[PDB]
UniProtKB/Swiss-Prot annotation:
Residue ranges annotated for the Peptidase C3 domain, each copy included: 1-179
Residues represented out of the complete protein: 1508 to 1687 of 2150
Role, per record: Major viral protease that mediates proteolytic processing of the polyprotein. Cleaves host EIF5B, contributing to host translation shutoff. Also cleaves host PABPC1, contributing to host translation shutoff. Cleaves host NLRP1, triggers host N-glycine-mediated degradation of the autoinhibitory NLRP1 N-terminal fragment.
Organism: Human rhinovirus 2
Intracellular or extracellular location(s): Host cytoplasm
Active site: H40 (for protease 3c activity), E71 (for protease 3c activity), C147 (for protease 3c activity)
Stated name of the protein: Protease 3C
Recorded catalytic activity of this chain's protein: Selective cleavage of Gln-|-Gly bond in the poliovirus polyprotein. In other picornavirus reactions Glu may be substituted for Gln, and Ser or Thr for Gly
Length: 180
């Protein structure tokens, strides 16, 4: 009940469907007009937010200090609405987390919560041949359509779903220092 309730509140207050030319993604609204999507979504000068074409004012693809992509892209949107500020839920450090959930919005008829089990700080992987850092891994057969899904626990917004191989699933980590 409560684990699913927290996820449904994240969907209600902090999600949107983002469409780029490469597909539909669950977009996590962090605060003000800032949303995160996987970098591989390759957002352009405009995106659709719940079907409405919206100009992107600023876009940041995040990399670690060694220049390895994190697969987090932050977009500042040209619109009125401000997202509920969920920066207080974002961890300061990399860690492992037991019994996590993924909150999904895009590519399905209604928002749903999937329990993905225990999550580990997995390090770097090769995502379609390109090194990607700070992955959070779970043993769940995530599929196309899950990207952007919000990995969370009650009071903890941990990452966004970016990839998988039919056995395991991977989220890009969210760290508090990615925002001021
Ligand atoms: C979300 C995006 C999506 O649905 O794309 C529209 C079809 C995908 C979720 C994945 C798909 C399979 N299961 C999932 O959880 N994510 C992807 O498809 C990502 C992004 C692409 C990509 C596209 C363009 C440019 C760069 C990258 C690659 N990819 C992957 O998940 C891959 N998986 C891996 O490389 C991999 C490595 C390891 C350890 O685990 N998975 C592809 C499925 C090959």
């Amino acid at each position: 009940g409560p684990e699913e309730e927290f996820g449904m509140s994240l969907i209600k207050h902090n999600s949107c469907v983002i469409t780029t030319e490469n597909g539909k993604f669950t977009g996590l609204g962090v605060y003000d007009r800032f949303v995160v999507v996987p970098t591989h979504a390759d957002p352009g000068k405009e995106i659709q937010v719940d079907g409405i074409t919206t100009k992107v004012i600023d876009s940041y693809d995040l990399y670690n200090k060694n220049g390895i992509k994190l697969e987090i892209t932050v977009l500042k949107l040209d619109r009125n609405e401000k997202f509920r500020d969920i920066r207080r839920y974002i961890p300061n450090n990399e860690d492992d987390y037991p019994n996590c959930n993924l909150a999904l919005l895009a590519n399905q008829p209604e928002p749903t919560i999937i329990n993905v089990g225990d999550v580990v700080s997995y390090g770097n992987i090769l995502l379609s041949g390109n090194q990607t850092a700070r992955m959070l891994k779970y043993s769940y057969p995530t599929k196309s359509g899950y990207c952007g899904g919000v990995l969370y626990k009650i009071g903890q917004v941990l990452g966004i779903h970016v990839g998988g191989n039919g056995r395991d699933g991977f989220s890009a980590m969210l760290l508090r220092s990615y925002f001021t």
